Design a binder for this molecule. Structure first.
Ligand SMILES: Cc1cc2nc3c(=O)[nH]c(=O)nc-3n(C[C@H](O)[C@H](O)[C@H](O)COP(=O)(O)OP(=O)(O)OC[C@H]3O[C@@H](n4cnc5c(N)ncnc54)[C@H](O)[C@@H]3O)c2cc1C
Ligand SMILES: Cc1cc2nc3c(=O)[nH]c(=O)nc-3n(C[C@H](O)[C@H](O)[C@H](O)COP(=O)(O)OP(=O)(O)OC[C@H]3O[C@@H](n4cnc5c(N)ncnc54)[C@H](O)[C@@H]3O)c2cc1C
Ligand SMILES: O=S([O-])[O-]
Ligand SMILES: O=S([O-])[O-]
Ligand SMILES: O=S([O-])[O-]
Lengths: 485, 484
């Protein structure tokens, strides 16, 4: 018989959630987790991308930037605070790493209490029902299991140019960087790029963002553009329609000096500039190519690296499942991986028939001005239902907290997208402003219940809170009405 | 015919909202607003309780307290900030009044643009379809209208004891107080009492709360008790089951020194202590007794002062309507008054048949730890549906922002209340934590759509944000499971 009921390959958000849930049904479970180091040698503990080099440290550094702004705001509220307050990168990073270390330990303890075997080893299939585990010393051991769950996540992509691995960093290195990045170039335009750029500027750095085409491809573009305009007003420089072709080291150091050469995407024009740090945020690649899928028959999308799965998270191979960021056509989010993992365990071992619902899943981008959304972008809604059947209600708003400091009127923005063919069903929700994620969450539940504009209008606001703007939206884009407060 | 289509008595949240909406239908409208001064002389501009002496300044002073805590938190996030930061009451109050002054102006401008007549005069009915308006010099003018809207709001209550009007203040005076209150006694246990106590402590004052019976009567009591415990851990002192019997002035000043004597509610025990400022937050009374209702036949509840109305906001007198805090059995909230006013204007003049919906209206209490809720308290749900038919799911949580400063784990708290006889319909929602109102608003919209537990569980969380706790609540009170 098999060594385990279930072996899980990857101890991140999805893998750990599935492992804890499967162990409630008295199953024998092993989790394999290993962190291959970045090209410059960075590694970390158990818990995956989110805990170590993703959501958690990112939000903490965003909070540090927010706190910088709160120091300024406090003066008009009467706090007698000295004029210049400087920021200490090492102190910040030490507190972030301390918290991450406690999570690393929490997860190890938790697996032990649930009687899940944890092996700090890299897993690679070698034949049906069999996997090889290789630890940090190169010792190999072979294990078998009745079922397997692939939850290996992704890792940052490089550009394939001279000097990129040698001199640049990615998000994987940023969050434990042992020196202040200094003058920084962020290459890319994903949410990670913009978030990182945002918090680095918010702690006082000179930041530049180099963008291949557009910001936040896949997100509502009018929202994306407002985010960018706000970043630019707060001193972040944008270089539009360029990609780096090489990175050269002018001087080593911590940080050193780097010369970046870059080429226009739509012409032959070339540019050069120098930076202390270059952060590459040009996508992520799925960890699906070096895990012996070919020895067990698992098919993947050879071009993207993603794994297609059934609506129960089964690969083409019936005893092998997959969840999380490696899935094709799903979403790269922690709570999605967590829900997929828990529900999977419940279907396999608890008799449940409930499937993970990947529709209308909310997100938030933690740019200096935060952006929460759920459902369709305006352009997707127009594509799906037709322009004549879509009504968009919108407004600017001004958080009360920002009045006394006297800043940033008419930046925060709210809209809902309604389908006129279906009782003005709210098919998209978008907010730009503080605590955007806190705002969005409950409206995402309301979308699950079929919220219509009429229901939304009958809902009473809470005063004085930003979110209440959603209960009185009466001006449509189609009307051409003015929406400046 | 009449001088006006509609005369509105009271230029506060409800009255202004109704006036702006009625003017969209090309009606001739007047708003009467007058602010009778507090016993110590405080007065203010157009806009009502909320703008001048309620929601707006209260949330701004709450924000000042929050910023104090942010100063502390900033150190662990790497900001090299000096050890002691002091707070300046006058600077805070000056900025708050400056903002209120821009709102006073905004509402006058907005009436004028809508062609609504604004008269700074106190209104008192004198006969059918007729009202007398008295200005600050005592000049009287008579106006008529086809319909009237009463929206006069409420004012703070005193205790009826020696020294109370002479030496104490209320919320009406607090927000423009020209000096720092110093050592403060807050008398009462309403949301106003606790919010004011909370921000005063948050800006560094020595604060004591004197409570007659319980905290936040009318609200979920387990939530109320957690709020109080949190206040107490942060240095707010509570005096339990006492009421003041007199206030005596030891020394005049700004602030002075006051001696408060108080009596136990359930014994003969007596106590004394001294304070710089005494803030009374012991309820509010409806401005319904000095407006000539008897000359037009409008019936009120003589005991409470509140006005019963139909579901269309009509009093017993068919050309006279009422909205806002004075209504019997409704809710004392700005957005409720605003909605009621707008929808009333639309029914009277726009052919709408839509009524204000007073069910599952959310609220937030802006105590140091904020409390948002919507729907039923646990004890009201149990009364209404029966204990065996109620499931409560709950959990503590720890905002990520609080980890690095390393404080206050297992304080923030979330629960939903479900009706097992109706598909686990979520009939109550409760959250204790930061940004509680931002969290509660969308869940209130979900309650309007009939949210069930299954739908809530199928909703995916946003990570890492406090509100996501609501999407994974699996532990019930009934199960006895541990939730730390
Ligand atoms: C900068 C950044 C910010 C983000 N912010 C957010 C956010 O705000 N909110 C949000 O919801 N999501 C966010 N995400 C995404 C979130 O991190 C991922 O959605 C989530 O971690 C994916 O979980 P997972 O289980 O699929 O993979 P991971 O958590 O990446 O776990 C994969 C684990 O498997 C390990 N592994 C890989 N191959 C092997 C092998 N062969 N054997 C053993 N172990 C292996 C990996 O090292 C890792 O430990 C962010 C991501 C990044 C990079
Ligand atoms: C300290 C405090 C905090 C509060 N916080 C909140 C909160 O966070 N959120 C919230 O939603 N609500 C809050 N409220 C309540 C909110 O302020 C009221 O619900 C709301 O203002 C009621 O609006 P209204 O139109 O009923 O009356 P008001 O705005 O009180 O308006 C009544 C107006 O009529 C004037 N007036 C009275 N009699 C006459 C007369 N005879 N003739 C002419 N004018 C007259 C009054 O002076 C006043 O201008 C708070 C209240 C207080 C006291
Ligand atoms: O601005 S120079 O140090 O890269
Ligand atoms: O291979 S999955 O698309 O059935
Ligand atoms: O106003 S009643 O006396 O007709």
């Amino acid at each position: 018989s098999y060594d385990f009921d279930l072996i899980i390959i990857g101890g991140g958000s999805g893998g750990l959630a599935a492992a804890k849930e499967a162990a409630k049904f008295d199953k024998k479970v092993m989790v394999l987790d290993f962190v291959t180091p970045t090209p410059l040698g960075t590694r970390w503990g158990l818990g995956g991308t989110c805990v170590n080099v993703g959501c958690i440290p990112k939000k903490l550094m965003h909070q540090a930037a927010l706190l910088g702004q709160a120091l300024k705001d406090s003066r008009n509220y009467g706090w007698k605070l000295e004029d210049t307050v400087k920021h200490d990168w090492e102190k910040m990073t030490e507190s972030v790493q301390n918290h991450i270390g406690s999570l690393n330990w929490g997860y190890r303890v938790a697996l032990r209490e649930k009687k899940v075997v944890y092996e700090n080893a890299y897993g690679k299939f070698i034949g049906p029902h069999k996997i090889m585990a290789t630890n940090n010393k190169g010792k190999e051991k072979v294990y078998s299991a009745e079922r397997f769950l692939i939850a290996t996540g992704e890792r940052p992509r490089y550009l394939g140019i001279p000097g990129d691995k040698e001199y640049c960093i990615s998000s994987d290195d940023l969050f434990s960087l042992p020196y202040c990045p200094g003058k920084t170039l962020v290459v890319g335009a994903s949410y990670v790029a913009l978030e990182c750029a945002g918090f680095l500027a918010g702690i006082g750095l000179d930041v530049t963002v180099m963008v291949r085409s557009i910001l936040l491809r896949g997100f509502d573009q009018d929202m994306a553009n407002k985010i960018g305009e706000h970043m630019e007003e707060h001193g972040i420089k944008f270089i539009r329609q360029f990609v780096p072709t090489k990175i050269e080291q002018i001087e080593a150091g911590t940080p050193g000096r780097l010369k970046v050469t870059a080429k226009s995407t739509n012409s032959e024009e070339t540019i050069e500039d120098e930076f202390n740090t270059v952060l590459l945020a040009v996508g992520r690649d799925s960890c699906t190519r070096t895990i012996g899928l070919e020895t067990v028959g698992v098919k993947i999308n050879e071009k993207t690296g993603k794994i297609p799965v059934t609506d129960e998270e089964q690969t083409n191979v019936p005893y092998i499942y997959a969840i999380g960021d490696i899935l094709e056509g799903k979403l790269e989010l922690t709570p999605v991986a967590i829900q997929a993992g828990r529900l999977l365990a419940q279907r396999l071992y608890g008799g449940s028939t409930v499937k993970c619902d990947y529709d209308n899943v909310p997100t938030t981008v933690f740019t200096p001005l935060e952006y929460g959304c759920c459902g369709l972008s305006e352009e997707k809604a127009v594509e799906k239902f037709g322009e004549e059947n879509i009504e968009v209600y919108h407004s600017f708003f001004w958080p009360l907290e920002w009045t006394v400091p006297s800043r940033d009127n008419n930046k925060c923005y709210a809209k809902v997208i309604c389908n006129l063919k279906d009782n003005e069903r709210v098919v998209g929700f978008h907010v730009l402003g503080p605590n955007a994620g806190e705002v969005t969450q409950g409206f995402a539940a309301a979308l699950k219940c079929g919220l219509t504009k009429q229901q939304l209008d009958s809902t009473i606001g809470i005063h004085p809170v930003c979110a209440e703007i959603f209960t009185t939206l009466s001006v449509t884009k189609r009307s051409g009405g003015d929406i400046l407060q």
